[PDB]
Design a protein around this ligand. Structure first.
Ligand SMILES: [Zn+2]
Ligand SMILES: [Zn+2]
Ligand SMILES: [Zn+2]
Lengths: 64, 41, 46, 263
């Protein structure tokens, strides 16, 4: 619904990386993988975390 | 004029409110913008 | 000073019951929401 | 200083790569397991929700709170709540944190873990503080509000071990390898045409002499050297994942001597 706080598998915090990831795509124009590696998410477990999140709360917030 | 009845109306048919609505309008109305219609209540 | 009910639609603490109707005060909408206890609810964060 | 030898190769606030040298596999794996499972640490473990008009549910939120890593350098000087003589919690067994948020702006208001206020007396033990590692110092995103929406909570943190729930774990991944060339034949390599063409060389091979094709297998060799790399989430600095790791084992073993004595 939100970025999960950690990688389910290794525990690395990853919930402090969502705004940055999305800034790193739209503002500085990197491809999704270069971006993830810049935030230091280098095992495929953590990468899967950000790369496959879906921010559904951004839809939930349109209701009144 | 002269009433003869009640017709259950299919969601997102031309007759139902949702078919003209925009995305904002669907959120104000509490209807998920991904619902697709085609059934009755 | 209190809560009891809420208006599903026009968002506004109603508070009423029996011989009272089941509608509203400043939208006329027939749908009401019960409103959260004050008894405090605790979660284990697990 | 004879015994198990150390050899750091990299270090960073966040990781420490090293080589243990002159130990058994068992002790090396055991210290791995301890670092993962049994170093004490501090974590939200009770949450009371005064208000939440948020688009998330409470336990969804609560769960997320227990996962925000919270400073834990002084955690020997917090007693386990179950060991303390208080009724429930207090300042000897608990930090209490607060969270209030209201979507004041038109645009969407985020709630981060810096918005966490400690409300209890620390006795100047460095514990409790939300850890923050991003450039903007926001730490973790907990929630999001819309204009009109509110969230008010209290939390109690408590000392805990990842055995009990992983939120209390200080370590993240722990790299761990040995015998990069395969000289010990502890593993037997699957392949289609050639085992060496088809498997990638570990980084740890440079460090260690390739074997020579003649060399008839060495039956006597043992696994004596281990390429580790511990990574910390931040509630405890790193070097300290290791040292309190070594220290936690050493105490487990001693509780065994202590309990022979009591027989
Ligand atoms: Zn991971
Ligand atoms: Zn109303
Ligand atoms: Zn206490």
């Amino acid at each position: 619904m939100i970025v999960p706080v950690r990688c389910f598998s290794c525990g690395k915090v990853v919930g402090d990386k969502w705004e940055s990831y999305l800034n790193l795509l739209q503002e500085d124009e990197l491809d999704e993988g270069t971006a993830l590696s810049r935030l230091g998410l280098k095992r495929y477990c953590c990468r899967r975390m950000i790369l496959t999140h879906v921010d559904l709360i951004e839809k939930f917030l349109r209701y009144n | 004029k002269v009433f003869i009845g009640r017709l259950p109306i299919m969601l997102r048919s031309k007759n139902c409110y949702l078919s003209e609505a925009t995305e904002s309008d669907l959120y104000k109305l509490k209807e998920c913008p991904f619902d697709m219609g085609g059934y009755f209540i | 000073a209190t809560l009891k009910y809420i208006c599903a639609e026009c968002s506004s603490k109603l508070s009423l019951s029996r011989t009272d109707a089941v509608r509203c005060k400043d939208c006329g909408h027939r749908i009401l929401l019960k409103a959260r206890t004050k008894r405090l609810v605790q979660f284990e964060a697990r | 200083e004879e015994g198990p030898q150390v050899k750091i190769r990299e270090a960073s606030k966040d990781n420490v790569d090293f080589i243990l040298s002159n130990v058994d596999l068992a002790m090396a794996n055991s210290l791995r397991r301890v670092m993962i499972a049994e170093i004490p640490t501090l974590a939200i473990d009770s949450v009371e929700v005064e208000t939440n008009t948020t688009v998330l549910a409470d336990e969804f939120i609560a769960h997320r709170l227990g996962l925000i890593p919270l400073q834990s350098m002084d955690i020997e000087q917090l007693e386990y709540s179950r060991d303390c003589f208080c009724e429930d919690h207090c300042d000897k067994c608990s930090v209490v944190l607060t969270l209030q948020a209201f979507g004041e702006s038109e645009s969407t208001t985020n709630v981060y873990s810096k918005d966490l206020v400690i409300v209890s007396n620390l006795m100047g033990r460095n514990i409790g503080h939300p850890i923050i590692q991003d450039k903007e110092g926001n730490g973790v995103l907990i929630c999001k509000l819309r204009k009109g929406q509110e969230l008010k909570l209290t939390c109690v943190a408590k000392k805990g071990i990842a055995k009990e729930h992983a939120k209390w774990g200080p370590a993240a991944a722990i790299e761990f390898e040995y015998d990069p060339w395969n000289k010990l034949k502890h593993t037997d390599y699957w392949y289609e045409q050639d085992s060496a063409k088809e498997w990638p060389q570990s980084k740890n091979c440079e460090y260690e002499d390739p074997p020579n094709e003649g060399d008839p297998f060495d039956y006597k060799a043992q696994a004596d050297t281990f390429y580790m790399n511990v990574e910390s989430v931040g509630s405890i600095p790193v070097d300290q994942v290791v040292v309190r790791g070594i220290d936690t084992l050493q105490k487990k073993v001693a509780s065994i001597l202590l309990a022979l004595t009591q027989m």
